[PDB]
Structure 1
Amino acid sequence: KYICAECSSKLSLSRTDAVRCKDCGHRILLKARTKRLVQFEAR
Protein backbone atom coordinates (compact mmCIF):
# COMPACT_ATOMS: atom_id res chain seq x y z
CA LYS A 1 0.00 0.00 0.00
CA TYR A 2 0.93 3.67 -0.40
CA ILE A 3 -0.65 7.11 -0.12
CA CYS A 4 -0.69 10.24 -2.26
CA ALA A 5 1.15 13.40 -1.25
CA GLU A 6 -1.43 16.10 -2.11
CA CYS A 7 -4.85 14.49 -1.61
CA SER A 8 -3.51 11.49 0.37
CA SER A 9 -5.45 9.10 -1.86
CA LYS A 10 -5.24 5.41 -0.97
CA LEU A 11 -3.32 3.51 -3.66
CA SER A 12 -1.77 0.08 -4.13
CA LEU A 13 1.27 -0.29 -6.39
CA SER A 14 2.99 -3.35 -7.85
CA ARG A 15 6.71 -3.87 -8.50
CA THR A 16 6.35 -2.70 -12.13
CA ASP A 17 3.65 -0.01 -12.01
CA ALA A 18 4.58 3.62 -12.56
CA VAL A 19 5.19 5.63 -9.37
CA ARG A 20 2.32 8.08 -9.82
CA CYS A 21 -1.02 8.97 -8.29
CA LYS A 22 -4.12 8.04 -10.27
CA ASP A 23 -6.28 11.08 -9.42
CA CYS A 24 -3.75 13.93 -9.16
CA GLY A 25 -0.88 12.45 -11.17
CA HIS A 26 1.88 13.58 -8.83
CA ARG A 27 5.30 11.93 -8.62
CA ILE A 28 5.64 11.96 -4.80
CA LEU A 29 4.32 8.90 -2.95
CA LEU A 30 4.44 8.04 0.75
CA LYS A 31 4.23 4.66 2.47
CA ALA A 32 1.66 3.57 5.05
CA ARG A 33 2.43 2.70 8.66
CA THR A 34 2.46 -0.94 9.73
CA LYS A 35 -1.23 -1.72 10.24
CA ARG A 36 -0.48 -4.53 12.70
CA LEU A 37 1.03 -2.87 15.77
CA VAL A 38 4.16 -4.76 16.81
CA GLN A 39 5.39 -4.81 20.40
CA PHE A 40 9.09 -4.26 21.08
CA GLU A 41 11.59 -4.12 23.93
CA ALA A 42 14.24 -1.39 23.96
CA ARG A 43 17.61 -3.01 24.67
Structure 2
Amino acid sequence: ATLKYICAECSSKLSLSRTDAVRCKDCGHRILLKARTKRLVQFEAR
Protein backbone atom coordinates (compact mmCIF):
# COMPACT_ATOMS: atom_id res chain seq x y z
CA ALA A 1 0.00 0.00 0.00
CA THR A 2 0.92 3.64 0.09
CA LEU A 3 2.47 4.37 3.42
CA LYS A 4 2.89 7.00 6.09
CA TYR A 5 4.84 5.38 8.90
CA ILE A 6 6.37 2.10 9.90
CA CYS A 7 6.47 0.67 13.34
CA ALA A 8 10.08 0.14 14.15
CA GLU A 9 9.60 -3.11 16.07
CA CYS A 10 6.66 -4.76 14.30
CA SER A 11 7.98 -3.63 10.88
CA SER A 12 4.46 -3.36 9.47
CA LYS A 13 2.67 -0.29 8.20
CA LEU A 14 0.66 2.54 9.62
CA SER A 15 -0.83 5.93 8.95
CA LEU A 16 -1.35 8.85 11.26
CA SER A 17 -2.45 12.46 11.29
CA ARG A 18 -1.17 14.89 13.89
CA THR A 19 -2.68 12.70 16.58
CA ASP A 20 -0.60 10.43 18.77
CA ALA A 21 3.11 10.04 17.75
CA VAL A 22 3.43 6.55 19.22
CA ARG A 23 1.83 3.16 19.51
CA CYS A 24 2.52 0.70 16.86
CA LYS A 25 -1.04 -0.31 17.57
CA ASP A 26 -0.03 -3.93 17.69
CA CYS A 27 3.18 -3.65 19.66
CA GLY A 28 2.36 -0.21 20.99
CA HIS A 29 5.86 0.89 20.23
CA ARG A 30 7.10 4.40 20.67
CA ILE A 31 9.40 4.74 17.65
CA LEU A 32 8.20 5.03 14.08
CA LEU A 33 9.98 5.45 10.79
CA LYS A 34 9.01 7.86 8.10
CA ALA A 35 8.02 5.45 5.36
CA ARG A 36 10.43 6.04 2.50
CA THR A 37 9.22 8.34 -0.25
CA LYS A 38 8.23 7.40 -3.78
CA ARG A 39 9.97 10.15 -5.69
CA LEU A 40 11.92 7.68 -7.80
CA VAL A 41 15.20 9.18 -6.76
CA GLN A 42 17.81 9.60 -9.45
CA PHE A 43 21.36 8.36 -9.19
CA GLU A 44 24.67 8.80 -10.90
CA ALA A 45 26.39 5.54 -11.65
CA ARG A 46 29.86 6.87 -10.98
Report the TM-score when normalising by structure 2. 0.67
Q: Percent identity?
A: 100
**Partner residue in 1 for 2:12:** 9
Q: Provide the alpha-carbon RMSD of the alignment.
A: 2.5
**Partner residue in 2 for 1:19:** 22
C-alpha displacement at 1:39, in angstroms?
3.9
Q: How many residues align?
A: 43
Structure 1 gaps of 5+ residues are: none
Report the TM-score when normalising by structure 1. 0.70
Structure 2 gaps of 5+ residues are: none
